[PDB]
Amino acid sequence: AKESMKNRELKRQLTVAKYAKKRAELKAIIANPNSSAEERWNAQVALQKQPRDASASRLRNRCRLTGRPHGFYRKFGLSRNKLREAAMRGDVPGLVKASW
Amino acid sequence: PRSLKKGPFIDLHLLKKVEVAVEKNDRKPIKTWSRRSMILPHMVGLTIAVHNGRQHVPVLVNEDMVGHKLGEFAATRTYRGHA
Amino acid sequence: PRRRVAAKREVLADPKYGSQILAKFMNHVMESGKKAVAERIVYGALDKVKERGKADPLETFEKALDAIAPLVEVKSRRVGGATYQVPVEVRPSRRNALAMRWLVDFARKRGEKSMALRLAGELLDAAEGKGAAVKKREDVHRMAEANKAFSH
Amino acid sequence: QIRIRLKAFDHRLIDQSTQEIVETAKRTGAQVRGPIPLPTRKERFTVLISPHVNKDARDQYEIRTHKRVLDIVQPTDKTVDALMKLDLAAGVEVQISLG
Amino acid sequence: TQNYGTGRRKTATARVFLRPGTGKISINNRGLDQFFGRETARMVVRQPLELTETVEKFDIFVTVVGGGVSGQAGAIRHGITRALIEYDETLRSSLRKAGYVTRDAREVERKKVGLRKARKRPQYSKR
Amino acid sequence: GQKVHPNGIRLGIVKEHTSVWYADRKNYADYLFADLKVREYLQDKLKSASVSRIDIHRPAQTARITIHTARPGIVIGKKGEDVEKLRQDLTKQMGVPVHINIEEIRKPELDAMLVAQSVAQQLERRVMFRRAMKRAVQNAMRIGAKGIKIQVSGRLGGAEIARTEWYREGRVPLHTLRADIDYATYEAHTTYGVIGVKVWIFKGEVIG
RNA sequence: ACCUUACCUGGCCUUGACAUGCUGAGAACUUUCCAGAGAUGGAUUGGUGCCUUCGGGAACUCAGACACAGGUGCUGCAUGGCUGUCGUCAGCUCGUGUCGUGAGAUGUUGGGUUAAGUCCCGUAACGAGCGCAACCCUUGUCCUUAGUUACCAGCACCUCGGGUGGGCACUCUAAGGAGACUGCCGGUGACAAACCGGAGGAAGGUGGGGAUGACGUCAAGUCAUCAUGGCCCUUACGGCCAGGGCUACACACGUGCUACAAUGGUCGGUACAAAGGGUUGCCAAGCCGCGAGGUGGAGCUAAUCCCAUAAAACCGAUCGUAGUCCGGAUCGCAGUCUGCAACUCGACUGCGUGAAGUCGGAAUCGCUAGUAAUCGUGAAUCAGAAUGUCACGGUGAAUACGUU
Ligand SMILES: [Mg+2]
Ligand SMILES: [Mg+2]
Ligand SMILES: [Mg+2]
Ligand SMILES: [Mg+2]
Ligand SMILES: [Mg+2]
Ligand SMILES: [Mg+2]
Ligand SMILES: [Mg+2]
Ligand SMILES: [Mg+2]
Ligand SMILES: [Mg+2]
Ligand SMILES: [Mg+2]
Ligand SMILES: [Mg+2]
Ligand SMILES: [Mg+2]
Ligand SMILES: [Mg+2]
Ligand SMILES: [Mg+2]
Ligand SMILES: [Mg+2]
Ligand SMILES: [Mg+2]
Ligand SMILES: [Mg+2]
Ligand SMILES: [Mg+2]
Ligand SMILES: [Mg+2]
Ligand SMILES: [Mg+2]
Ligand SMILES: [Mg+2]
Ligand SMILES: [Mg+2]
Ligand SMILES: [Mg+2]
Ligand SMILES: [Mg+2]
Ligand SMILES: [Mg+2]
């Protein structure tokens, strides 16, 4: 949970949202059924021209409070051992201990 | 293996260097880090020094090693043997 | 257990012979919850029994069961230096359970084509005292009567 | 004709809202097709409680979503909208259809 | 006329209707043999009929849903017994001694945390 | 042995959630993050005002914040030059516009969080924990407070070893789910390390 | 796989990727360029913006100077918080009184009884507290409320589908209640607490299961989730980037999965679940491929549409005890999908090959009823990646004389 880790994940999220659409039509051109080979090649080279650290696959979502890479839950935004703290105090609406 | 939708995968800078190296024939190795790049059929007969993790190993390319990747000719672990 | 609180259950539903003992025998031959497979095996064995000859297959079944239940059982007990083996009479309920367990276990290891054939062979052979189960019963009986000194 | 869908995280206040909507509808002279309790949605979580290695020591949590359906027949006065601040007060999600 | 019973067994339920008839029997609008194929399910679904010796007189209409085949058969038996009780409500004893009126409460025990199954544990090597 | 959080296990029985709103998968995480951040910010700024409970309600696209404090005059002073500034600030943080009202808590010494505040502050002021904990128990039990328990753990005084000392009075049934136990935890950051303070307060039973 | 990432090799920054304080110079942005592995640097068509007390200012961007920032660096034997363990074991104490010179004792000992320091009866002790039990969730029966997207008993039509008109009967869903209390009877018992049986009931003796963890123990675990006392680095123990590593392999151990087959393997015909997830999503019908899959775009912010065909079981045919129509490892060739990118190092598909394995030494583990055994389904994490984890149903046993 170094501050550098959080800073650079924020940078990654900003830069992936920066383009966020050129990638879309470039993928559409590459995967198009009938698009000719030359368009395929131009799309490939254009998409590879983009910065490497600009794809959604490099985003590793962390705890928005501590930046813990592991034990993340997407229903909340919290990690494993901040969710329990929030839920015990009754902050989280709807969350209760259950047995069934 | 990569799908057949896009035949090869080659890096732009490595491809540019390879295509430059044909105006004057094979004389010097091309220094690179791109182990992910597949060898093309038209760069045969030229020597490429690929990164290893500590240095660059020189590989002389012949016709039989076309469909492979550069990183396949640079072992990243030593293991001289337990005994 | 220590509390002596175990209560016995009542599930006993012979479908088409209406014989109380065959349901428990099928429970003994059952493996891994597959009631139907054991059902089929036992019925096939009884069909083989009824077609080898004129004997009622069910009657041959309880005749074999009677001719295989042991009368006395040997119980081990360490007396402080050696483990002796006293005899004791077998409870009426334990006799039939021991008989079925032995019969099934020895039919498991015969070596004919299908398990139903193994079971049929065991019932035919033990119905007069010639199977492996009957000689195990004789071994238990002689072992028990060779320790009659303790008995009490 | 108008239909109302009600969603909440607990049963007391959703019951209160259903009761008040129904009684207002009865007072205003309209007809109501009875409230329908749709099956609740139960989503469960199992979370480790130690900061470090204790795998068998877990703790389990749950969220329940309760859903009710109302619908009215023969409407002439439309003040169910007029209670936009009151039909839903704190934590009730209300969906209106056939407005 | 008619009588209605609701049977329940192992997450399965059955609605049974008894009318005057000649033992037609129909489950989910198909015959008993087509539903329970060569097992004791026929025996268990018929048991109260012969114990009360009214197998031939009642026409039965059944709709069953949920569970497995044995659970469905148990549901049919339970519903049949309840409807038979409400028809001629004097033989409650006769079924009671047979244990048909009682509803079996056994259910699938839930999985527990740290265990493999509801009761099985990992192997426990001590060294 | 490790206990369970008394506030956590009594949710839906005697206790109520601080935040009361409905959200769906679109924006549940956003609302939860906003609630946590605004609670941290509000508790951080106005520590001087004795604030314990901060409830958040979210009707359609709007927020209402109710603050429980023992100093209404401090938060709302001379017509409230601070409440309006706080309103604009909290509207800057939260997406939705914010409505604020201040609800004072009568009997401040009966609130577990306020008692923890006071004990931690005294331990900051180098007061002997003996006297602090005794006086807290006495002031609580003198009026109401049908039971109370206080626990202080750490390097008490300046000893080069950490221990736990706890004082109890009345009856505090922790295994009873009908007991409206009010619980609080707080940290005192001293010159040698952290000292933890835990407070349980038992008001009484509830029926119906 | 890259990222995670904390490690290695090399390239590169020094108020710095991030905070506040000072100063000067300008908006932010958008420009599809070149060099480089990239970090980065040099070029770069466009409007130089908003509010104006027109003195200027805000946000944002860039450069300098210091106080600084920064550290997944050390100490868990300086700590907070959180957790395991004994142990869901039935115990652990206090106030007043009394006994002893004192440490201490009494209460809390004794006869019964209980799952229980549970209760009764006696008693220099009289009371209280934390534990036990009850309150809580779920499952098992019944009633009221309500009948849509759920249901179809009765009626009408029906292309024979709850498909339609319609119905409030039923199943079901979900809120409120009833019910189970040793309540009634016989016997024993100090005619007490209680115990053994019986009737009624869906359920009988804390009905089944779960949550609930007393005072303390182990200087138990965590400084790497977070927080933090002291110590340590500040041209590096801080920060940025590209390749590699965490996947190595003469060996040893722990936990699983698949088998060694005939209660079985293949082919054909057929029946019955629960639970859950889907708008940066699920992803149909039709069509194209042996296949993984590709095109397509309907429906659904969901009791409505999708994921989505449950499997074992049953019926028919074949195999006939063979290292085999068993077993599937390994390897060769050819592909699909995700992803900037499947060499190191992904998951699947087709064709071929077809290993060890014939029920396992000393030793050792789980399980008492819907349990063990066995069969399948779903979700979290997640671009892709589960034989693990957590849940869900189907079929369905053996045994307990007893405390040596
Ligand atoms: Mg930090
Ligand atoms: Mg990832
Ligand atoms: Mg269950
Ligand atoms: Mg071992
Ligand atoms: Mg420490
Ligand atoms: Mg420790
Ligand atoms: Mg500590
Ligand atoms: Mg004690
Ligand atoms: Mg005392
Ligand atoms: Mg005393
Ligand atoms: Mg004295
Ligand atoms: Mg004592
Ligand atoms: Mg006693
Ligand atoms: Mg007690
Ligand atoms: Mg009875
Ligand atoms: Mg009884
Ligand atoms: Mg309890
Ligand atoms: Mg616990
Ligand atoms: Mg230690
Ligand atoms: Mg250690
Ligand atoms: Mg790297
Ligand atoms: Mg590893
Ligand atoms: Mg095969
Ligand atoms: Mg047990
Ligand atoms: Mg199961």
List keywords for this structure.
part of a larger assembly, 6 chains, B: 83 residues, alpha+beta, 1 helix, D: 99 residues, four-stranded antiparallel sheet, RNA-binding
Describe the structure.
This is part of a larger assembly, with chains A (100 residues), B (83 residues), C (152 residues), D (99 residues), E (127 residues) and F (208 residues). Helix content of chain A is 49%, strand content 2%. Chain A contains 4 helices and 1 strand. Chain C is mainly alpha-helical and 152 residues long. Chain C has a two-stranded antiparallel sheet with strand order 1-2. The longest helix of chain C is centred in the first third of the chain and has 18 residues, at 35-52. In chain F, strands 1-2-3-4 form a 4-stranded mixed beta sheet, with helices on one face. In chain F, strands 6-5-8-7 form a 4-stranded antiparallel beta sheet, with helices on one face. The longest helix of chain F has 18 residues, at 28-45. Chains in contact: A-B, A-D, A-F, C-E, D-E, D-F. Chain D binds chain E through residues 46, 55-56, 58, 60, and chain E through 113-114. Bound molecules: magnesium ion (MG) (25 copies). One magnesium ion binds next to loops of chain E. Residues 108, 110 of chain E line the site of one magnesium ion. Chain E binds one RNA strand of 404 nucleotides through strand 1, strand 2, strand 3 and helix 3. Chain D: Part of the 30S ribosomal subunit. Chain D: GO terms for molecular function: structural constituent of ribosome; tRNA binding. Chain D: Keywords: Ribonucleoprotein, Ribosomal protein. Chain D: Involved in the binding of tRNA to the ribosomes.
Biggest sheet features of chain F: 4 strands, mixed
Count of helical segments of chain E? Answer: 4
Biggest contact = A-F, 19 and 23 residues
Strand order of the largest sheet of chain F: 1-2-3-4
Q: Could you give a quick summary of the protein structure above?
A:
This is part of a larger assembly, with chains A (100 residues), B (83 residues), C (152 residues), D (99 residues), E (127 residues) and F (208 residues). By secondary structure, chain A is mainly alpha-helical.
SSE order and pairing:
This is part of a larger assembly, with chains A (100 residues), B (83 residues), C (152 residues), D (99 residues), E (127 residues) and F (208 residues).
Chain B: H1 12-20, E1 30-32, E2 47-51, E3 56-60
Chain D: E1 2-8, H1 11-27, E2 31-48, E3 58-73, E4 93-97
Antiparallel strand pairs in D: 1-3, 1-4, 2-3
Chain E: E1 3-9, E2 12-20, H1 32-35, H2 41-51, E3 58-65, H3 69-87, H4 92-98
Antiparallel strand pairs in E: 1-2, 2-3
The complex binds magnesium ion (MG) (25 copies).
The structure holds one RNA strand of 404 nucleotides.
